[PDB]
Amino acid sequence: MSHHWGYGKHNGPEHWHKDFPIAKGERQSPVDIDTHTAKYDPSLKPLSVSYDQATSLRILNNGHAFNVEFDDSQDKAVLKGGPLDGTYRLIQFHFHWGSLDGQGSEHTVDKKKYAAELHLVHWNTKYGDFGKAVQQPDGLAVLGIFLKVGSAKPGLQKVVDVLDSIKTKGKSADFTNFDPRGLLPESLDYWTYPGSLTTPPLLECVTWIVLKEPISVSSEQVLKFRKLNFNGEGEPEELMVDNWRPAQPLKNRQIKASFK
Ligand SMILES: NC(=O)OCc1ccccc1
Ligand SMILES: [Zn+2]
C-alpha cells in the first residue's frame, strides 16, 4: 500500500534499489541471452506445458501491466519438465512492451530487444500457495515468450478487445474461458537460468524458461496495449508504455539451452 515504484524518470528501474536492495542482488532478471555462450544441456528433460484445463477468471490493470488471472485452486494448467523438479501451477500471465516496436522486451537476445515479452507465471505446488512459493529459490517458473510485430496473433485478439474496459489502474473485468495455448509459438526450444521477479519486490525465486521462437502480433494489436494507462481513473493520463526493466548483470550464472 506504500509502494511508489514505477517506470518513470523519477521512480524507474534505476531507483528501485533504494526500497528493494535485492535489486543489486546475485540473481536478478532480466538478462541478456548471449546465444553463442549459452550451452546446450543434455541433462534437460522435455518441457511439458499442459494448458488444456486452464480456466481464466479475470483481467486486471494493476498500474504496471495487465494480468490475466487463472483459477489455481486445483491442479489444472501446469508446467513441468525441462529444468524443473516438480509441478508448477499457472496463476497469471502478463506482458511488458514498449512505446516503439524496437523496444519492450525485458530479456534480450544478443542485445536485441523485441517489441514485447509475455510472462506466464507458475508456482511450485510443493510450497502450497503462491505467497509461500515466492519465498523459495525454486518457488516460481516463468515462461517467457518474445513478441515481434508482423502478422496478427489470432489467439491474442480476445485480450486486445477487452483492454478498453480496464484502461486505468485498479480496473478489472471478467475474463473467462481464455485459452493460453493460443499464445504459444510452434517450438518449445528454450534457454533457462535462475533469476528473479523483474518488478519489485524483485524476489530471487524464479526459474526462467525463455522460448527461442517469438510469436508475431500485429501493429494494431500492440498499439492497443499502448493505449492503456499507468494512472487511475480521473488522474493525469500517462500511457502504459515501456513497462520493462533493462538487462541486469549475469554475475555467477550460466544460461543453458535446451537445443542444438
Ligand atoms: N515480471 C515478472 O517477474 O513476472 C514474473 C512474476 C512472478 C510473480 C509475480 C509477479 C511477476
Ligand atoms: Zn513480467
Q: What is the largest CA-CA distance in the chain?
A: 54
- Residue 4 counted as an annotated binding residue: no
Report the 10 Å Cβ neighbour count for 14: 12
Write the Ramachandran bin of 10: left for phi over 0, alpha for psi from -120 to 50, otherwise beta: alpha
Interval between CA 144 and ligand 2 midpoint (Å): 8
Sign of the Cα torsion 120, 254, 104, 61 reads: positive
Residue 65 near residue 97 (C-beta atoms within 8 A): no
- Residue 94 counted as an annotated binding residue: yes
Interval between CA 38 and ligand 2 midpoint (Å): 22
Classify 110 as helix, strand or coil.
coil
Instruction: Compute the distance between CA of residue 240 and CA of residue 53 in angstroms, rounded to an integer.
Output: 31
Q: Amino acid identity, residue 210? A: V
Cite the active site residues.
64
C-alpha cell at 236: 493525469
Closest listed residue to residue 77, CA positions, set 59, 67, 89, 85: 89
Classify 243 as helix, strand or coil.
coil
Residue 242 near residue 102 (C-beta atoms within 8 A): no
Report the 10 Å Cβ neighbour count for 19: 15
Method used to obtain the model: X-ray
30's CB contacts (< 8 A; 6+ apart) are 105, 106, 107, 108, 195, 198, 244, 245, 246, 247, 248
Q: Which ligand is nearest to the CA of 134?
A: 1
Instruction: Compute the distance between CA of residue 19 and CA of residue 37 in angstroms, rounded to an integer.
Output: 33
Report the 10 Å Cβ neighbour count for 16: 20
Instruction: List the domains of the chain with CATH numbers.
Output: 1-260 (3.10.200.10)
